Swiss-Prot record, chain B:
PANTHER family: 26S PROTEASOME NON-ATPASE REGULATORY SUBUNIT 7, EUKARYOTIC TRANSLATION INITIATION FACTOR 3 SUBUNIT F-RELATED. It holds the Pfam family JAB. Component of the 19S proteasome regulatory particle complex. The 26S proteasome consists of a 20S core particle (CP) and two 19S regulatory subunits (RP). The regulatory particle is made of a lid composed of 9 subunits including PSMD7, a base containing 6 ATPases and few additional components. Within the complex, PSMD7 interacts with subunit PSMD4 through their respective MPN domain. Interacts with TRIM5. It comes from Homo sapiens (Human). InterPro entries: EIF3F/CSN6-like_C, JAMM/MPN+_dom, MPN, MPN_RPN7_8. This is 26S proteasome non-ATPase regulatory subunit 7. The modification N6-acetyllysine is found at K200, K210. One of its GO terms (biological process) is proteasome-mediated ubiquitin-dependent protein catabolic process. The gene is PSMD7. Residues 5-140 form the MPN domain.
Curated annotation (Swiss-Prot), chain C:
It comes from the Eukaryota. The chain holds residues 284 to 376 of 376 of the full protein. The modification N6-acetyllysine is found at K15. This is 26S proteasome non-ATPase regulatory subunit 13. It comes from Homo sapiens. The gene is PSMD13. Component of the 19S proteasome regulatory particle complex. The 26S proteasome consists of a 20S core particle (CP) and two 19S regulatory subunits (RP). The regulatory particle is made of a lid composed of 9 subunits including PSMD13, a base containing 6 ATPases and few additional components.
Curated annotation (Swiss-Prot), chain D:
Component of the 19S proteasome regulatory particle complex. The 26S proteasome consists of a 20S core particle (CP) and two 19S regulatory subunits (RP). The regulatory particle is made of a lid composed of 9 subunits, a base containing 6 ATPases and few additional components including PSMD1. Interacts with ADRM1. Interacts with ZFAND1. The chain holds residues 398 to 787 of 953 of the full protein. The modification N6-acetyllysine is found at K323. It comes from the Eukaryota. Component of the 26S proteasome, a multiprotein complex involved in the ATP-dependent degradation of ubiquitinated proteins. This complex plays a key role in the maintenance of protein homeostasis by removing misfolded or damaged proteins, which could impair cellular functions, and by removing proteins whose functions are no longer required. Therefore, the proteasome participates in numerous cellular processes, including cell cycle progression, apoptosis, or DNA damage repair. PC repeats lie at residues 6-39, 44-77, 79-113, 114-148, 150-183, 184-219, 220-252, 254-288, 289-329, 332-364. This is 26S proteasome non-ATPase regulatory subunit 1. Belongs to the proteasome subunit S1 family.
Swiss-Prot record, chain E:
Belongs to the peptidase M67A family. PSMD14 subfamily. It comes from the Eukaryota. Component of the 19S proteasome regulatory particle complex. The 26S proteasome consists of a 20S core particle (CP) and two 19S regulatory subunits (RP). The regulatory particle is made of a lid composed of 9 subunits including PSMD4, a base containing 6 ATPases and few additional components. Within the complex, PSMD4 interacts with subunit PSMD7 through their respective MPN domain. Interacts with TXNL1. The modification Phosphoserine is found at S12, S86. This is 26S proteasome non-ATPase regulatory subunit 14. Component of the 26S proteasome, a multiprotein complex involved in the ATP-dependent degradation of ubiquitinated proteins. This complex plays a key role in the maintenance of protein homeostasis by removing misfolded or damaged proteins, which could impair cellular functions, and by removing proteins whose functions are no longer required. Therefore, the proteasome participates in numerous cellular processes, including cell cycle progression, apoptosis, or DNA damage repair. The chain holds residues 139 to 310 of 310 of the full protein. The keyword Ribonucleoprotein does not apply. The lineage of its organism: Eukaryota, Metazoa, Chordata, Craniata, Vertebrata. The modification Phosphothreonine is found at T119. GO terms for cellular component: cytosol; cytosolic proteasome complex; extracellular region; ficolin-1-rich granule lumen; nucleoplasm; nucleus; proteasome accessory complex; proteasome complex. Its EC number is 3.4.19.-.
């Protein structure tokens, strides 16, 4: 096993409600939460997973806790509606992981972005060299629609790592009909 | 929705100890902890409370953290060991509120639909009573804005409970009990004259804020109307109380009659025993 | 008007009212039926006595004149308060 | 503790003087040649060497400071540090300023009190501006009673006979918290005004003596008059007789001590007559302290002057030959007997010589002798208040 | 140490220090002396009342301990602030009742004053040959002092507040 803390960053914006990505996009990101919580059950249960959004608020309803059955109950009535702010999402998740219990856990975090965010590349490079001085690899999986080939988050992937800490893997969004498990099959292959 | 509060000093000391818990570590802004309560009438009571960890960066005042699992756990603890209590709000130690506090309020108004905060001061010198109460209701606006969700200043006090001062008045030890008859009245004179007319002069400094500034809510709804409740006495020169000098003489009347009669009887008290025992001691001293 | 005058003539109400003498009575009773004033209907002299009224909008010049008579009250009561306390200052011990 | 320490300390009290033969008479009583209970059959050995070399030091700087520097912990260094400061008056010892504060690092058990005493004795009446800072900007941030009370006595001891030179700092001590700096400001004005009838101390003295609610500081404040009024001692009893009727045994106890420590070289009949109903008190230890002060008042005293000598000796017989008195009444009673025949009526106390120069170890001895709630060899230092009447 | 805490919650409102704490010393040290307490001078200054005669019956391997109520500079002056500045008129601006305590005080004074003036009937000479010395000036100096001075300042309230 391995000691880390992955903060699932769901999108509750008003773009995640249609059915281009499979029979609900809510169900698409919900199956994503299913596979990451089962994956951290298959990982070390000493690790912890908590919920957070980037849109409409920074909503903490569960603590970053090693249980996730209550998170599976928190899957329901997510009601995705609001306006995206992922640039506060990185920092709010990072302070949530500076509110942890142990330092031997690593910090490999995922993120789900599904809307056009007003994110300057200077904003996310402040965040990115901040994470260079905060030791966090982030594996973002693009959902929804902002661009068919995301660039700002590609720039964050570029500006997070160098030569040793290349733990930034960006599944850009396939904005046409692509499956529910074919999106998350590549990070469960390689995060 | 809230009539007033009855708040014991014990919960304030329960704020003080967690202030001691945070003064030794890296203190970014302040304390945010749970305020339990004993809500019975539209009046309010608090017997006890406890805290919760909290940090807050200042970039978009939205990054702020509690632990609702820990909160409900120790709530279940103190609810089991005392079924009288329940949560009633929160508190903060920095005496000036900020814009994140509405997010704090509405994020904890989900357990019970009211969550009254408590401003306190760990270093109070100039204020009156530390305890303060807001409530989050809407009047929506005169211009009817999209949800002008306003804290509304509910009245407050320090509460009272039998035999909770057993520690307190034994500890402080310095109390001059029942100074009626000496200088308490002039302490109230100095402080109410100066420290209330400076509130008045800072109200007129806020009026100068309305002069040079103050377009914001300039507030021609409640200000002059409660100031008209003041303006029940427009006390301009020539003093206008020809119809009250005789009433003031009537005020002087009975008390000076008591003074004359009674203090003549007080001289009559002193002189008798003073003369008798005086010359007793004097010419029976030898 | 300056503070109240404490007693206000039929000419005043009838002059601002552009009405006769024998209607300001109905007027002040009708104001009691409205309930904006709690007044005593002083008409032994046709000169009316004043109580509390529901106020109207404080103007900018009325903000300034309010500052005038209000700071008059404020610093006069504060200054003569400090004078009373200056006489009451000697017996503290 | 004091079984060990008093057992090897009373030998050095008997060895007052005795310059050369100390090492080859305590060859069995080196710090490594005894195997104590814990640390005091080896602590009181160096204490007795400090008593032997009181105010007349040879190698009693290097020798003593090394054997305390080569000493296991702070729980040993006590009496060596006290006698080190006692003999190191004006020797400009720097290690007593260097290693004591960083020896305690925050505090000690009672050798922080020893540290305050040692730096005060080497810096007597000095205005040690290094140690004004490094003592009274140090006695606030720890919490115990012993370390703070001992630095209180130390910052009292560092300032002596000043007559103007400390009193703003004294009221700066007055504006501090309850048990420490106000108490020490009282002791420091008791030492800064030794020998004069200054009417400056008496203001805050009486004020904090009765107006205050803490009571040990009241006891200290009525103790202070014997410290400041030993040159003209006939002022006190006529007004401390009214202090004798306080609510508390604190102020009554200090009022019983004041008539003693003001006039103990004399045998005035009126102070005796006013100690009489005070040793007829309901509270036990105020009677005890009155008897202690009367044993101070009757040293060297023949019966032909004031006949209450035999009266109080047979009263001491009465209090010593029954069991149902106070527990430390016997402590005080045979203490009163050992004081009562000190040297065999050979030595006496005088805080002031005849030619107008004071006798500063007597002043030091009485201000030492008062605070016996801990470090009982503050009683043992009353040998330092004894004089060569020859 | 494992020190006990003993309390009775029905005692007083500001005064009593009801808490009681102990240290059971073992019966295995029955050979050695009981409660040495190296100095036993501040322990004797704990020994002051010989309190609780049934616990002093229970002095078989028990003794109470010193408990001071120490200062909190972070808390003491602000508790004093709470206490005083919330009880001196609350906001310090409120009462600075008054017109029926006139009659209440005149009753409470005069009805006691006639029995206060009875005893000079019985005053006489032959110094110890009479036995009933009791003071009579009590609560008619001071109650009338506080009463009339505070209510004449209440007659001053109108000139103090009003101009």
């Amino acid at each position: 096993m391995v000691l880390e803390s992955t903060m699932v960053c769901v999108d509750n914006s008003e773009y995640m409600r249609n059915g281009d990505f499979l029979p609900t996009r809510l169900q698409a990101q919900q199956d994503a939460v299913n596979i990451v919580c089962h994956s951290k059950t298959r990982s070390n249960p000493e690790n912890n997973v908590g919920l957070i959004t980037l849109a409409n608020d920074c909503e903490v309803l569960t603590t970053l806790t090693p249980d996730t059955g209550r998170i599976l109950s928190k899957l329901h009535t997510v009601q995705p509606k609001g306006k995206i702010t992922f640039c506060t999402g990185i920092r709010v998740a990072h302070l949530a992981l500076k509110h942890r219990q142990g330092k031997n856990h690593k910090m490999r975090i995922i993120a789900f972005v599904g809307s056009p965010v007003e994110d300057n590349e200077k904003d996310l490079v402040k965040l990115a060299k901040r994470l260079k001085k905060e030791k966090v690899n982030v594996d973002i999986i693009n959902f929804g629609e902002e661009e068919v080939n995301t660039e700002k988050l590609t720039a964050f992937v570029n500006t997070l790592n160098g030569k040793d800490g290349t733990g930034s893997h960006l599944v850009t969004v396939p904005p046409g009909p692509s499956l529910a498990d074919a999106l998350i099959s590549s990070p469960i292959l390689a995060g | 929705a809230v009539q007033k509060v009855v708040v014991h000093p014990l919960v304030l000391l329960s704020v003080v100890d967690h202030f001691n818990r945070i003064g030794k570590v890296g203190n970014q802004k302040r304390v945010v902890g749970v305020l339990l309560g004993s809500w019975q009438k539209k009046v309010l009571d608090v017997s006890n409370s406890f805290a919760v960890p909290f940090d807050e960066d200042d970039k978009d005042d939205s990054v702020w953290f509690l632990d609702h699992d820990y909160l409900e756990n120790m709530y279940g603890m103190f609810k089991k060991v005392n079924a009288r209590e329940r949560i009633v709000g929160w508190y903060h130690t920095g005496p000036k509120l900020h814009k994140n506090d509405i997010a704090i309020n509405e994020l904890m108004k989900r357990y019970c639909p009211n969550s009254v905060l408590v401003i306190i001061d760990v270093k109070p010198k100039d204020l009156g009573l530390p305890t303060e109460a807001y409530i989050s209701v809407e009047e929506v606006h005169d211009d009817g804005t999209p949800t002008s969700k306003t804290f509304e200043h509910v009245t407050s006090e320090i509460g009272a409970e039998e035999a909770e001062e057993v520690g307190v008045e034994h500890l402080l030890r310095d109390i001059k009990d029942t100074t009626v008859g000496t200088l308490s009245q002039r302490i109230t004179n100095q402080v109410h004259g100066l420290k209330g007319l400076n509130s008045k002069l800072l109200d007129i400094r806020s009026y100068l804020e309305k002069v040079a500034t103050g377009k914001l809510p300039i507030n021609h709804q409640i200000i002059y109307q409660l100031q008209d409740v003041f303006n029940l006495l427009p006390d301009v020169s020539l003093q206008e109380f020809v119809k009250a000098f005789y009433l003031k003489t009537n005020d002087q009347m009975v008390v000076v009659y008591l003074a004359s009669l009674i203090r003549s009887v007080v001289a009559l008290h002193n002189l008798i025993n003073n003369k008798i025992a005086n010359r007793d001691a004097e010419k029976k001293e030898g | 008007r300056p503070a109240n005058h404490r007693q206000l003539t039929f000419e005043e109400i009838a002059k601002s009212a552009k009405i006769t003498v024998n209607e300001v009575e109905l007027l002040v009773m009708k104001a009691l039926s409205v309930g904006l004033v709690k007044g005593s209907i002083d008409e032994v002299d046709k000169r009316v006595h004043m109580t509390w009224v529901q106020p109207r909008v404080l103007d900018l010049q009325q903000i300034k004149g309010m500052k005038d008579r209000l700071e008059f009250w404020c610093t006069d009561v504060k200054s003569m308060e400090m004078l009373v306390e200056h006489q009451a200052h000697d017996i503290l011990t | 503790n004091w079984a060990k320490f008093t057992a090897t300390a009373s030998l050095g009290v008997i060895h007052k003087g005795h310059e050369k033969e100390a090492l080859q008479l305590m060859a069995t009583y080196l710090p490594k040649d005894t195997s104590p209970g814990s640390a005091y059959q080896e602590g009181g050995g160096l204490y007795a060497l400090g008593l032997i070399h009181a105010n007349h030091g040879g190698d009693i700087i290097d020798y003593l400071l090394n054997q305390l520097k080569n000493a296991s912990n702070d729980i040993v260094r006590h009496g060596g540090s006290l006698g080190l400061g006692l003999a190191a008056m004006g020797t400009a010892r720097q290690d007593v300023y260097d290693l004591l504060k960083t020896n305690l690092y925050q505090d000690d058990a009672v050798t922080g009190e020893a540290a305050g005493l040692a730096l005060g004795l080497v810096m007597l009446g000095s205005k040690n501006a290094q140690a004004i800072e490094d003592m009274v900007g140090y006695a606030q941030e720890t919490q115990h009673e012993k370390i703070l009370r001992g630095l209180a006595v130390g910052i009292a001891l560092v300032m002596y006979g000043r007559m103007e030179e400390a009193d703003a700092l004294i009221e700066s001590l007055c504006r501090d918290k309850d048990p420490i700096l106000r108490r020490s400001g009282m002791y420091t004005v008791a030492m800064a005004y030794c020998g004069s009838g200054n009417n400056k101390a008496i203001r805050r003295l009486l004020h904090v003596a009765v107006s205050d609610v803490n009571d040990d500081v009241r006891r200290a404040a009525v103790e202070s008059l014997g410290f400041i009024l030993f040159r003209t001692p006939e002022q006190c009893p006529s007004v401390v007789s009214l202090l004798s009727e306080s609510y508390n045994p604190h102020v009554r106890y200090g009022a019983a001590m004041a008539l003693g420590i003001c006039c103990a070289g004399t045998g005035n009949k009126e102070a005796i007559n006013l100690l009489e109903p005070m040793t007829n008190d309901p509270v036990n230890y105020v009677r005890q302290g009155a008897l202690i002060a009367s044993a101070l008042i009757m040293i060297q005293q023949t019966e032909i002057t004031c006949p209450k000598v035999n009266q109080f000796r047979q009263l001491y017989s009465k209090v010593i030959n029954d069991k149902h008195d106070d527990v430390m009444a016997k402590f005080g009673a045979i203490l009163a007997q050992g004081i009562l025949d000190a040297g065999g009526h050979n030595v006496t106390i005088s805080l002031q010589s005849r030619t107008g120069h004071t006798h500063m170890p007597s002043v030091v001895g009485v201000l030492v002798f008062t605070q016996f709630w801990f470090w009982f060899p503050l009683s043992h230092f009353l040998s330092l208040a004894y004089t060569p009447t020859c | 140490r494992a020190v006990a805490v003993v309390v009775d919650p029905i005692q007083s409102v500001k005064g009593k220090v009801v808490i009681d704490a102990f240290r059971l010393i073992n019966a295995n040290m029955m050979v050695l002396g009981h409660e040495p307490r190296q100095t036993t001078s501040n322990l004797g200054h704990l020994n002051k009342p010989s309190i609780q005669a049934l616990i002093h019956g229970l002095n078989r391997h028990y003794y109470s301990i010193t408990i001071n109520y120490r200062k909190n500079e972070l808390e003491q002056k602000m508790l004093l602030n709470l206490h005083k500045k919330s009880w001196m008129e609350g906001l310090t601006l409120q009462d600075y009742v008054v017109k029926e305590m006139l009659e209440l005080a005149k009753n409470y004074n005069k009805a006691v004053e006639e029995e206060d003036k009875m005893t000079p009937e019985q005053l006489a000479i032959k110094n110890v040959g009479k036995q009933d010395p009791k003071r009579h000036l009590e609560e008619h100096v001071d109650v009338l002092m506080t009463s009339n001075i505070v209510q004449c300042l209440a007659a001053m309230l109108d000139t103090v507040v009003f101009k």
